[PDB]
Amino acid sequence: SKPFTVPILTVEEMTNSRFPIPLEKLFTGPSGAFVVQPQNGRCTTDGVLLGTTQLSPVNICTFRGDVTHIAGSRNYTMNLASLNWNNYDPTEEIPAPLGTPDFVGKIQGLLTQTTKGDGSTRGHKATVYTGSAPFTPKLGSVQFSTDTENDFETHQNTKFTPVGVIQDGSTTHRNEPQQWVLPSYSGRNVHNVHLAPAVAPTFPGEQLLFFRSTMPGCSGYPNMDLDCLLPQEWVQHFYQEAAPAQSDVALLRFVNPDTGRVLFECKLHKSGYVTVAHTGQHDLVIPPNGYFRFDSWVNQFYTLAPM
Amino acid sequence: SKPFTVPILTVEEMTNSRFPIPLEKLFTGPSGAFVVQPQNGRCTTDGVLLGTTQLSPVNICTFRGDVTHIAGSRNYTMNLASLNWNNYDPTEEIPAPLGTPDFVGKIQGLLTQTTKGDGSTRGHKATVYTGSAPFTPKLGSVQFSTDTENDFETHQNTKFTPVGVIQDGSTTHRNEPQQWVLPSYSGRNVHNVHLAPAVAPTFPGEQLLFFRSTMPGCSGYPNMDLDCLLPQEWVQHFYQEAAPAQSDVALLRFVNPDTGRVLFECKLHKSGYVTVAHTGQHDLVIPPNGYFRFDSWVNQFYTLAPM
Ligand SMILES: CC(=O)N[C@H]1[C@@H](O[C@H]2[C@@H](O)[C@@H](CO)O[C@H](O)[C@@H]2O[C@@H]2O[C@@H](C)[C@@H](O)[C@@H](O)[C@@H]2O)O[C@H](CO)[C@H](O)[C@@H]1O
Ligand SMILES: CC(=O)N[C@H]1[C@@H](O[C@H]2[C@@H](O)[C@@H](CO)O[C@H](O)[C@@H]2O[C@@H]2O[C@@H](C)[C@@H](O)[C@@H](O)[C@@H]2O)O[C@H](CO)[C@H](O)[C@@H]1O
């Protein structure tokens, strides 16, 4: 079998696979109070994309299409198009368009538009509430709240570029976004389909290891923590390499090339997530040049040295 | 020598190295009316980053620091920090902080901020004019025009996330941005330093081959074309692989795995740019699964089959 590898990029050189921001740190914690089932940043070690995962680090939480104004408001409905501006196909066997947000929250950014005829352009602050009834990306429609009642034109290509998240400051602080709560991609009382599975540690004394970023906050008191299971660069790497998994777990060592010593070891499960031997919440302290290295194929219940 | 390779990702699976948006197409044209000296997306084939190039696809045209309000306006001065929020060091031998915009234009996005004490947040539309006298990123300072006169706090971490570009619609359409005009990183009448060199075809009948995207337009009639010399994924790949160049030019073939036939060939110069045998402006038509493949090391003046 073709030898398996992970990139040698450091954590801070890599990108969150769930929102277009750099990775900041590694974090581990118990995950019993939630279901860890993100749909972006999902890929097997042999390169099979899962859920709503696609390859672009900058086509995550974006939308494209044309918009229609909702009378008596600053709200616009976007009829979704594909990345190359073609009609959206709701019958593809995916949960929602690839790159669709995979958490319930209020994502703020800019809605921009070009008029084809003369190249005139416009841009307005906009928010999408992924927990709202009109959030139906699998059906081909989402709604944005904006700062205009009349500037956007119909039947002109329109893009949403995400920036960060908001919260209602008159309610309990940090109560949203909820990063581990999937939206209902087809709206209220319709089940999600074609999902990447939930993940959890399976061996005693282990926890998931998360690749963590802090989303920009744009209003209120949001929970800005965002954990992904794989860096976007790992998704791109496995997709290209397509090296076969020789067991259920790739043992990785995290090495400091400065001192030449292994800092810790972890399990990269072939379905695309990482666990470590630790109990409790912990922000890992790592050197800037630290990187992960594949060392060997082991079994699911291999006993790791404590992190 | 370690074998040289380029990624097998397709054009549409890759990212512009000069602005955080996907690649759309390949473009070639004559470049005599301009100096092609971009500072982002610059890397040798053996993995040496040049100019202001860094590794993150989502740390391009971003800024971070703290802000001070300019009385009697909606303008804020940002005192720049590093990616990990440390003091900026102007003595590093680079043209400007890595990821600094490398063109003269008006870049619009959102300026966001978190108050450390309570986690309160705020976000406002903001524009940076990279041709303006206060655009002095190499000195550690840039100015933003915003939509607020009082909401941003002092001595709190503040981020700018870029979205697109604007133009003054009362002046000649598409006269800005000017993608091939470098800002003056230390301001008026101070020479830029430590630049990646300008590039140009050197063999008769050749033109640069550009990796092209369309920036979102946020107001007016901007020129939204943006050409990079290398995809960001190629920068990341060469940085990791560090395969030695065995001649001045890596001959690449662009292959359609569908039909099994080579579509065209091109030269990847070891200093990190591509040329093709063509005269005239041309949007290349390529199949979605088309990709580049390294075939052999050749000399600078190797004669390519016409594109
Ligand atoms: C759209 C607008 O006019 N924004 C103002 C407004 O912003 C408020 C407002 O949107 C309320 C709505 O419930 O939500 C927040 O209170 C928001 O303020 C934002 O969040 C608070 C916690 C602070 O961090 C604040 O600085 C931030 O802007 O009023 C505020 C001033 O209170 C600003 O004037 C916005 O521009
Ligand atoms: C900030 C604001 O109030 N924006 C309005 C305004 O926007 C104008 C204005 O900013 C002028 C300043 O010289 O620049 C443009 O004209 C801009 O309009 C934008 O560009 C034109 C070419 C159109 O594409 C327009 O749709 C776009 O918004 O007025 C416009 C209406 O003319 C909107 O009301 C903005 O919200």
Automatic annotation (TrEMBL), chains A, B:
<keyword id="KW-0946">Virion</keyword>
<dbReference type="GO" id="GO:0046872">
    <property type="term" value="F:metal ion binding"/>
</dbReference>
<feature type="domain" description="Calicivirus coat protein C-terminal">
    <location>
        <begin position="81"/>
        <end position="307"/>
    </location>
</feature>
<dbReference type="GO" id="GO:0044423">
    <property type="term" value="C:virion component"/>
</dbReference>
<feature type="binding site">
    <location>
        <position position="305"/>
    </location>
    <ligand>
        <name>Mg(2+)</name>
    </ligand>
</feature>
<keyword id="KW-0479">Metal-binding</keyword>
<dbReference type="GO" id="GO:0030430">
    <property type="term" value="C:host cell cytoplasm"/>
</dbReference>
<protein>
    <submittedName>
        <fullName>VP1</fullName>
    </submittedName>
</protein>
<keyword id="KW-1035">Host cytoplasm</keyword>
